[PDB]
Amino acid sequence: MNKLAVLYAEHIATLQKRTREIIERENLDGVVFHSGQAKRQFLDDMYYPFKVNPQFKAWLPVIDNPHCWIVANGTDKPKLIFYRPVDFWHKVPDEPNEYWADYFDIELLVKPDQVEKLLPYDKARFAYIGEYLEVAQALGFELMNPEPVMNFYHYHRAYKTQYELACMREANKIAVQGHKAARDAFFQGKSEFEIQQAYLLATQHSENDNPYGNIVALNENCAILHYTHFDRVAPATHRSFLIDAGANFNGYAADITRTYDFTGEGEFAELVATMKQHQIALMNQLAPGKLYGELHLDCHQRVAQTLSDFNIVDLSADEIVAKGITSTFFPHGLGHHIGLQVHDVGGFMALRCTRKIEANQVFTIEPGLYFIDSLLGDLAATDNNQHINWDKVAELKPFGGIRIEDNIIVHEDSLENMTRELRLR
Amino acid sequence: MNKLAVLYAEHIATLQKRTREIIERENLDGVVFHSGQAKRQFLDDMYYPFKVNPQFKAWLPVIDNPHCWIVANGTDKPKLIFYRPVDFWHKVPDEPNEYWADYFDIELLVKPDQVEKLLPYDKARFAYIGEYLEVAQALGFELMNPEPVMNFYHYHRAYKTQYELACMREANKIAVQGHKAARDAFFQGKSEFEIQQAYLLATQHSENDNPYGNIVALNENCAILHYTHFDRVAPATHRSFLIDAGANFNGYAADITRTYDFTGEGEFAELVATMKQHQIALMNQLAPGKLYGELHLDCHQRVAQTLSDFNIVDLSADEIVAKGITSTFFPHGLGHHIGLQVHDVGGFMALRCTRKIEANQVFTIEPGLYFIDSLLGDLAATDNNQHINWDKVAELKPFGGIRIEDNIIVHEDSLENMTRELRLR
Numbered sequence: 001m002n003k004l005a006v007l008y009a010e011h012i013a014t015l016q017k018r019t020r021e022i023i024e025r026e027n028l029d030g031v032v033f034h035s036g037q038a039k040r041q042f043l044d045d046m047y048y049p050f051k052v053n054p055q056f057k058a059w060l061p062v063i064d065n066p067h068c069w070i071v072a073n074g075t076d077k078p079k080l081i082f083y084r085p086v087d088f089w090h091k092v093p094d095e096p097n098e099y100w101a102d103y104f105d106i107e108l109l110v111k112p113d114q115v116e117k118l119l120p121y122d123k124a125r126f127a128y129i130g131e132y133l134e135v136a137q138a139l140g141f142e143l144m145n146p147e148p149v150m151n152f153y154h155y156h157r158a159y160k161t162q163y164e165l166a167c168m169r170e171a172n173k174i175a176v177q178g179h180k181a182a183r184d185a186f187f188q189g190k191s192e193f194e195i196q197q198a199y200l201l202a203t204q205h206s207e208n209d210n211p212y213g214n215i216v217a218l219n220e221n222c223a224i225l226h227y228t229h230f231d232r233v234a235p236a237t238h239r240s241f242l243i244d245a246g247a248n249f250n251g252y253a254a255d256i257t258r259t260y261d262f263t264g265e266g267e268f269a270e271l272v273a274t275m276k277q278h279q280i281a282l283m284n285q286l287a288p289g290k291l292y293g294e295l296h297l298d299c300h301q302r303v304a305q306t307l308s309d310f311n312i313v314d315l316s317a318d319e320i321v322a323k324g325i326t327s328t329f330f331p332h333g334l335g336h337h338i339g340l341q342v343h344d345v346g347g348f349m350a351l352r353c354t355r356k357i358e359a360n361q362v363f364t365i366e367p368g369l370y371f372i373d374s375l376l377g378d379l380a381a382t383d384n385n386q387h388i389n390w391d392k393v394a395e396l397k398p399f400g401g402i403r404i405e406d407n408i409i410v411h412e413d414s415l416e417n418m419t420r421e422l423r424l425r
Numbered sequence: 426m427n428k429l430a431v432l433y434a435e436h437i438a439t440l441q442k443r444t445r446e447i448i449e450r451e452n453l454d455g456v457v458f459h460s461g462q463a464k465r466q467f468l469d470d471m472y473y474p475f476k477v478n479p480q481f482k483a484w485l486p487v488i489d490n491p492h493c494w495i496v497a498n499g500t501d502k503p504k505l506i507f508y509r510p511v512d513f514w515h516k517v518p519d520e521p522n523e524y525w526a527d528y529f530d531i532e533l534l535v536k537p538d539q540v541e542k543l544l545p546y547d548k549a550r551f552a553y554i555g556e557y558l559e560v561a562q563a564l565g566f567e568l569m570n571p572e573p574v575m576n577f578y579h580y581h582r583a584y585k586t587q588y589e590l591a592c593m594r595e596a597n598k599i600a601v602q603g604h605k606a607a608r609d610a611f612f613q614g615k616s617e618f619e620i621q622q623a624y625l626l627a628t629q630h631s632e633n634d635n636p637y638g639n640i641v642a643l644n645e646n647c648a649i650l651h652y653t654h655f656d657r658v659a660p661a662t663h664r665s666f667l668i669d670a671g672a673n674f675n676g677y678a679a680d681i682t683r684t685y686d687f688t689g690e691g692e693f694a695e696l697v698a699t700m701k702q703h704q705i706a707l708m709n710q711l712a713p714g715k716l717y718g719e720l721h722l723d724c725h726q727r728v729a730q731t732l733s734d735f736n737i738v739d740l741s742a743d744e745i746v747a748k749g750i751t752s753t754f755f756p757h758g759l760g761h762h763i764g765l766q767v768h769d770v771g772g773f774m775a776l777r778c779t780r781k782i783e784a785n786q787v788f789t790i791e792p793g794l795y796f797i798d799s800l801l802g803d804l805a806a807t808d809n810n811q812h813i814n815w816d817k818v819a820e821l822k823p824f825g826g827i828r829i830e831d832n833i834i835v836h837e838d839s840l841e842n843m844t845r846e847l848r849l850r
């Protein structure tokens with residue numbers, strides 16, 4: 001028996017039920033999900049790597065196949081037009097024969113432009129959920145990504161089926177293996193580039209297989225939030241390491257961050273150790289009914305208590321917050337839902353400090369503390385310039401910043417930190 | 426002094442001259458090249474990796490920056506609107522300060538929608554060369570990628586400036602380092618995936634940095650022409666290895682293939698050694714004035730002579746060709762131009778067996794010999810089924826196929842095989 005296979009049955013039942021409800025509320029005959037197509041590079045005969053329509057992979061783990069269509073109404077067996085071309089050029093895989101194949105009425109498609117005869121005869125009442133409006137209109141569809149249908153599925157995406165939670169445990173498990181290998185590489189003095197290679201090797205992921213662009217930062221780079229590049233030359237001296245990297249499994253993402261001190265001793269190393277405690281205490285505050293806003297406000301508080309205690313700012317926690325200067329050391333949000341998409345969808349009628357945490361949802365808790373040139377300089381142009389220990393700043397500035405991030409499943413009865421349960425210190 | 430820098434001056438002069446000629450022939454005030462934009466994934470806040478407009482990087486080595494614009498007329502100094510946003514989020518690089526920066530009148534762009542005021546006041550007579558027609562029309566442009574202008578630049582792209590040839594030598598040099606590391610990994614019994622990782626490490630290339638999707642094939646996979654995947658599990662037995670991989674330098678590509686036998690002894694290993702000889706003799710036939718057609722017809726001849734001598738087909742070379750069955754063992758073209766694009770552009774008014782090889786052009790010579798299921802089975806359904814040693818086929822089938830490919834610069838006085846001159850056996 002396959003645990004995933006058993007959970008999948010309920011997954012399908014759940015999407016089926018959700019489908020029945022929405023087509024009735026909108027008087028539709030059904031919904032058609034288009035996996036998408038490969039995008040061709042301008043004036044070239046090369047293509048950008050394929051990225052499946054999230055709304056299509058929500059149903060099954062087929063994420064590397066364009067020209068696939070799902071037609072469903074929630075009561076009848078969902079139809080799956082599965083693109084399987086034949087030609088000596090590409091390797092032809094066997095016909096879908098895994099556990100999920102049984103849940104669909106599968107029609108094979110040998111050429112993309114032969115899909116019209118496999119779709120409903122009258123497409124007018126079928127909502128087209130996909131990126132290719134022009135192709136949909138030519139086929140006869142009229143309802144393009146109707147907002148009410150998008151909002152419905154997105155809202156329910158926040159509530160993960162057991163199959164989804166299982167998939168997400170797997171993604172976290174792969175990512176963790178990578179974060180450890182990346183960790184070891186850092187302590188060996190490797191370059192950002194080399195560290196990235198180790199992560200990919202340990203997770204057996206190709207760059208285009210991870211859920212987002214990995215951030216493998218060293219020293220001052222740790223202060224660059226959207227740091228995309230990988231230096232090929234190792235730094236003369238190794239001070240800090242920040243790696244925000246994830247993994248994929250059946251279309252579900254992991255999104256983990258870890259910051260380290262090269263020596264394990266000193267101010268920065270202590271700062272990290274503190275942030276970790278604050279980070280865990282924040283994870284610990286997740287519970288059904290809890291307002292994300294409280295968690296957020298609390299994070300800024302912890303940050304202020306950190307800035308105060310490390311003499312980075314010569315003021316009391318409450319006054320650091322009061323004066324509103326914590327945002328210069330922690331400029332981003334505390335967390336977000338995650339699942340099929342890294343920054344997952346959801347929320348009443350299209351992360352606000354107003355929504356409540358609920359069971360079966362999955363979150364990331366990622367408090368941070370950075371020393372950003374631009375953001376700091378701005379703080380100097382205010383009457384608060386007199387309140388920070390600029391000597392303490394220049395001493396840490398060389399370490400860039402800190403961020404610790406886990407993915408946690410909020411069960412009705414408890415919290416499951418997939419990341420730390422995998423033993424990622 | 427910088428050799429590249431000195432060659433670049435002439436590069437600019439050349440593009441300038443080409444620009445003057447075309448705008449006069451088409452009565453235009455100038456030409457505007459748009460580097461492009463990042464494409465956002467459907468319903469997500471993630472983007473596909475950026476791919477620069479080839480027509481924009483033809484001018485300078487800026488290939489990772491969207492929202493950049495070049496406006497030129499060929500007599501005045503070309504203008505370069507260089508996107509350089511500022512914000513604590515992304516790492517801000519210094520203002521362009523390399524050798525090529527001096528050849529342009531550089532305006533910095535901090536936000537994509539602030540480009541209108543930096544472009545010509547009257548855009549009507551400026552041809553827009555780019556992918557974003559909608560954005561161009563909103564800015565006021567009317568002439569969208571006019572065919573005569575596209576054809577002109579494309580035609581001249583076949584003739585490489587010295588700067589371009591130098592760039593291409595560099596790409597070949599990086600790729601070779603990778604092909605050797607990949608080679609060693611194969612002999613160590615690593616998996617396709619592991620071999621791919623070694624190649625990337627040796628070339629210091631991220632997957633999205635190479636010019637096309639690497640083909641790292643093992644055993645039977647060597648017979649799959651468009652083989653994209655990388656098995657994570659090494660084969661029980663290592664028989665054959667085929668790696669078609671390249672590299673980039675300033676936007677110019679290398680495109681190299683090499684096939685190996687695991688033991689270095691046996692039929693297949695002998696077959697490879699022969700193909701190499703045929704491959705080199707084909708490279709040797711490149712010369713200004715030569716018709717690609719002769720080279721092509723000659724390749725099929727060599728293939729037939731190979732099939733005949735290895736008793737893969739019980740017929741004489743001439744009759745293998747005569748009966749037209751070589752195409753089942755060698756189904757693709759012999760070579761193509763290469764440069765800014767792997768399959769480079771060019772040719773009289775938008776690789777034909779009719780065009781002639783000329784000086785300063787760059788080519789790939791890639792004869793192959795494969796054992797493809799589908800293609801072979803088809804040969805069985807013909808009266809030629811009685812002509813092939815099906816016992817000899819089943820013996821080689823397990824090795825997949827062969828392809829050897831080099832990139833060669835055709836100088837007016839000689840041939841320069843960048844690949845073999847780098848010592849890639």
Ligand SMILES: [Mn+2]
Binds near residue numbers: 105107
């Ligand atoms: Mn059926």
Ligand SMILES: [Mn+2]
Binds near residue numbers: 244245257405
């Ligand atoms: Mn993250």
Ligand SMILES: [Mn+2]
Binds near residue numbers: 255336405
């Ligand atoms: Mn995150």
Ligand SMILES: [Mn+2]
Binds near residue numbers: 530531532
């Ligand atoms: Mn200027």
Ligand SMILES: [Mn+2]
Binds near residue numbers: 682
């Ligand atoms: Mn190739």
Ligand SMILES: [Mn+2]
Binds near residue numbers: 680761789791
């Ligand atoms: Mn090629």
